[PDB]
Each structure stands twice: as structure tokens, then as C-alpha cells.
Amino acid sequence: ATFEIVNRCSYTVWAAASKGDAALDAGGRQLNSGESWTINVEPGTNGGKIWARTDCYFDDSGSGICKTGDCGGLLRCKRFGRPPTTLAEFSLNQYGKDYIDISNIKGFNVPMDFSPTTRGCRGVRCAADIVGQCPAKLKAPGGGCNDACTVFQTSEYCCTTGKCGPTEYSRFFKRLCPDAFSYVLDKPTTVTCPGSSNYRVTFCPTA
């Protein structure tokens, strides 16, 4: 499956793609404002994620640091990134179907649209100005908006026991971005696509 990853932000981002225990494709790449990077993701990829990282410095061997989304200091990511990170999430070819969603469960750093480029489903979008409207206690000093679990580490926010509900903090994400997951047990906003669809992830889809 191809994913075209487009940076429409006015700033540079460093796209990352991983399934948690491995990179997808090269796993990571700098995208200047306007650049596109097409990756190939193996069919049957389960629990893949794509995200953006901001304000990064990498040396010549590709080691360094990112203010948001850092995945162990590597340009080419092999694991998931450090919150806050808006996440494009997908599982491909799962009993004949693809599943996609956007999640705010690990916070928000960059607005995002996640759409199929092939026929038969709709895309999802989380493009509101969450960083600017973020509640004080969630503001990440390093940039972006943390989820409450990251900030407070309680069972209620992290949904450890499997029984949590919505909270003042999850309701903020959900009000700004109704079509993204705002906490673990949020009413699903996952989109079912035909198996083997292709996709585009766009950072800053709106002016």
C-alpha cells in the first residue's frame, strides 16, 4: 500500500512511520514545506502509525533529537514517538478490510488529514488549532498539547483497568476534533476501507 505523505505546513516536519517494533519503509524523513514523500507499507500491517515531528536536529549518522514525536533520537524511526503527537493510525488487510483513524490519545502537535486516494470510503481530519487553545495544564513546554494520561499518569486518564470514561481533558480534544479518538474508550471514529486501499496523510491540510 502506498501512503503519500504531504507537508502543507509553513515549517519543516520530519515525518515518521512505524508499527511499534519496526519501521515502515525508511521509517522517517525530512519534509520541507510543500514536500511529499511516498512510502510503501507491507500489506497486513497491523497497528501502523504515521506522525510528524517538529524542531529536530540530526547529525550525519541520523542521530539527534526532536521537540515532539522523538522516537529514540533516530531520523529513521523504528518505534513510536514521544508525545505529544497527532497520530494517523491504520491496520491493513484485516479480514479483507483496511481500518484508519486519527487519534489524539497521545496529544496533538500538528494538524492532519488522513484520506484514501482510492475509491470507496471517506477520510478523517483533525485540523483545528488545538495547540493555541490547549488547556494550561496540558501545554507541552517543548511544543504541542499533551494528553492527560501523559501529564497525570492516573488509571482514569490511562484507562488502565479497561473501565474509564470521558474527562474534562478528553472533552477538550473531542470538542476541537470530533473525528479523532479523544480517549481510549471513545466511541470509535474508525473508518473501514476496502482492503489494499492507498492513502494520503497531509500535515496542515487547511490554510
UniProtKB/Swiss-Prot annotation:
Top-rank taxon of the source lineage equals Eukaryota
Q: Which InterPro entries match?
A: Osmotin/thaumatin-like_sf, Thaumatin, Thaumatin_CS
Q: Where in the cell is it found?
A: Cytoplasmic vesicle
User: SMART domains from the xrefs?
Assistant: THN (SM00205)
The alphabetized UniProt keywords are: Cytoplasmic vesicle, Disulfide bond, Signal, Taste-modifying protein
Disulfide bridge partners, by residue number: C9-C204, C56-C66, C71-C77, C121-C193, C126-C177, C134-C145, C149-C158, C159-C164
| One Pfam family here | Thaumatin
Q: Which GO terms describe its cellular component?
A: cytoplasmic vesicle
Job of this protein: Taste-modifying protein; intensely sweet-tasting. It is 100000 times sweeter than sucrose on a molar basis.
The UniProt similarity line reads: Belongs to the thaumatin family.
Q: What is this protein called?
A: Thaumatin I
